């Protein structure tokens, strides 16, 4: 299990609060300036923190991510193998050579920033499709994740997972394709004006849908917990404003409440 710091991301990835990223190709797609490559980097960073052992193969065609940017996202640049790329053909040739030099068990995350601005060498959609069909088996055989950014039967159905990200500050992530999560699930991702990626994103809304948080007064919020013995939802005594909920004293008891975790899996996780 490789989970991130954002419980809403873990859900989008695995269907559960306690889940995380899988091996395979994940495409993060959407208009540019929606924080896609930051979400990508959060994932790379989590992988590299879980495995001090790991390296990141970083195929770069944008040149916006530098050592300083990586450090601020908590990625060690010393463990990043940087390959600038100017075409899909070159992307394919270099990925295949490196994926082939890797053994099952080695920790390696692939991050591609970005697919949509690479020339084949018109025939772009075709070449992109066959790049995916060529690299995806390696991801699965060698058991590694690959996160690809793509600024907006199609090529992206050769991927294992597709997130489409849009503007609702506030982002909506739409699960277009997944092995683990119901297609078309919508998750809310907040990015603060300081460019800060809220780890409490979407929790309060979701808990409100799932019943585990209610609203005694307008703009006030209360938790409700299922008592196994009496089959009733028991409110807490206390009432919170929305801003006081972004804290572990608020979320911690719910995250620990199995019914909350189960209501999330049942709402989102596949088969």
Say whether residue 63 binds its own copies (CB under 8 A). Answer: yes
**Cα-Cα-Cα-Cα dihedral sign, residues 64, 69, 75, 77:** positive
Q: Please, what is the minimum distance in Å from the beta carbon of residue 267 to its own copies?
A: 27
Q: How far is CA 84 from the centre of its chain?
A: 24
- Select the residue interacting with its own copies from 243, 256, 258, 271 (CB under 8 A): 243
33 labelled ligand-binding: yes
- Judged by beta carbon, residue 74 or residue 259, the one nearer its own copies is 74
Element (H, E) at 206: helix 203-210
Shortest reach from residue 82's CB to its own copies, in Å: 14
Give the chain's radius of gyration (CA, Å): 20
The neighbouring-strand residues paired with 24 are 145
Query: Which DSSP state fits 87?
Result: B
SS3 37: helix
Q: Is residue 256 annotated as involved in ligand binding? A: no
Pick 53 or 244: Cβ nearer its own copies: 244
The residues, any chain, with a CB within 8 Å of residue 44's CB and separated by 6 or more, are 56, 73, 75, 109, 111, 147
Cα→Cα distances 42→2, 7, 198, 210, Å: 12, 12, 12, 27
Q: Of 60, 73, 259, 265, which lies in the binding site for its own copies, with binding defined by CB under 8 A?
A: 73
Rounded CA-CA distance 129/147 in Å is 16
Q: Does 169 bind its own copies (CB under 8 A)?
A: no
Q: Does 166 bind its own copies (CB under 8 A)?
A: no
Task: Kindly write out the interface string for residues 3-42 of this chain, putting x where it contacts its own copies by CB under 8 A and - elsewhere.
Answer: --x---------------------------x-x-xx---x
Exactly one of 101, 103, 105, 193 binds its own copies (CB under 8 A); that residue is: 193
Q: Applying CB under 8 A, does 69 fall inside the site for its own copies? A: yes
| Chain positions contacting its own copies, by CB under 8 A | 5, 33, 35, 37-38, 42, 45, 49, 62-69, 71-75, 192-196, 240, 243-244, 246-249
Q: Which residues are annotated as a binding site for ATP?
A: 30-37
């Amino acid at each position: 299990v490789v989970r991130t710091k954002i419980p809403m991301m873990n859900i989008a990835l695995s269907g559960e609060i306690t889940g995380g990223m899988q091996s395979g190709l994940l495409i993060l797609a959407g208009p540019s300036k929606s924080f896609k490559s930051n979400f990508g980097l959060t994932m790379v960073s989590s992988y590299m923190r879980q495995y001090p052992d790991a390296v990141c193969l970083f195929y770069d065609s944008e040149f916006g991510i530098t050592p300083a940017y990586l450090r601020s996202m908590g990625v060690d640049p010393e463990r990043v193998i940087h390959t600038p790329v100017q075409s899909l053909e070159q992307l394919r040739i270099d990925m295949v050579n490196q994926l082939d030099a890797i053994e099952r068990g080695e920790k390696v995350v692939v991050f591609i920033d970005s697919l949509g601005n690479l020339a084949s060498k018109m025939t772009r959609a075709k070449t992109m499709k066959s790049l995916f069909r060529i690299v995806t088996p390696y991801f699965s055989t060698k058991n590694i994740p690959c996160i690809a950014i793509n600024h907006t039967t199609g090529p992206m159905y050769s991927a294992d997972t597709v997130f489409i990200i849009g503007k609702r500050y506030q982002f909506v992530l739409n699960v277009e394709k997944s092995r683990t999560v119901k297609e078309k699930s919508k998750f809310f991702i907040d990015v603060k004006f300081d460019g800060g990626i809220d780890p409490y994103s979407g929790l309060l809304d979701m808990a409100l849908e799932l019943g585990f948080v209610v609203k005694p007064k307008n703009g006030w919020y209360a938790r409700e917990f299922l008592d196994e013995e009496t089959g009733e939802m028991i409110r807490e005594e206390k009432s919170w404003r929305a801003k006081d909920t972004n804290c572990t004293t608020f979320w911690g008891p719910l995250f620990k409440h199995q019914p909350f975790r189960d209501a999330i899996k049942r709402a989102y996780q596949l088969g």
